[PDB]
Amino acid sequence: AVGKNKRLSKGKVVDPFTRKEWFDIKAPSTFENRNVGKTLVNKSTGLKSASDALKGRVVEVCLADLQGSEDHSFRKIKLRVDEVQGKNLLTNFHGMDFTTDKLRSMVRKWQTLIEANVTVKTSDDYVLRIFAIAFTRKQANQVKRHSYAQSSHIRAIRKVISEILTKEVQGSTLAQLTSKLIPEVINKEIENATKDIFPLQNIHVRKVKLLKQPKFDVGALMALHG
């Protein structure tokens, strides 16, 4: 196609690398690697206010990147551009997501998948939609091939999961959520609730979407970035 175009301009230079400035983005207190990366932006003329034009952004980075841990490798955190203080700018939470390769690995047949969703408010004025994925498994001493559930087990699992979600998030603030989701104690809470129901392995968490935050509260963000 290098020489096919019949017209490049129906309408009838300076180097943008030199026209762009660097910036350096840091995480919140809830992740040990504060300094996580950089970015670029055109030089902040008075016409544009690069500060806000960059404020309107988000970045996905891996929890293995932010905690050194290849076991946390399969979780990615979207951190929002929320504060800028002279090219050592700061973020805050925006949303979790797994890796599709991990999901496509854990999903397989001759088992039973279960999925739950909740749209619940937190203690700190946000409102978040979290999901939860759980799988069945052949017991030890079992011989059958599939280990399919009976749907009442599943509806009950759904209920107990959802109420656990509401209970936790109603009382845990945003940073507390991050701090108790980085280890995923919630999955073991599920398994300890349900081990008189089904062995129930592979009980991971699933995405979470800020539906409406409160005001920014730059003071609170700086309190996190003390």
């Binding site: 290849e70 490798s73 890796t99 390769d101 991990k102 496509r104």
Partner: peptide, 10 residues
């Protein structure tokens, strides 16, 4: 290093 090098499952 020691990178898993994941795969397409579908």
């Amino acid at each position: 290093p020691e990178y898993a090098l994941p795969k397409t499952y579908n």
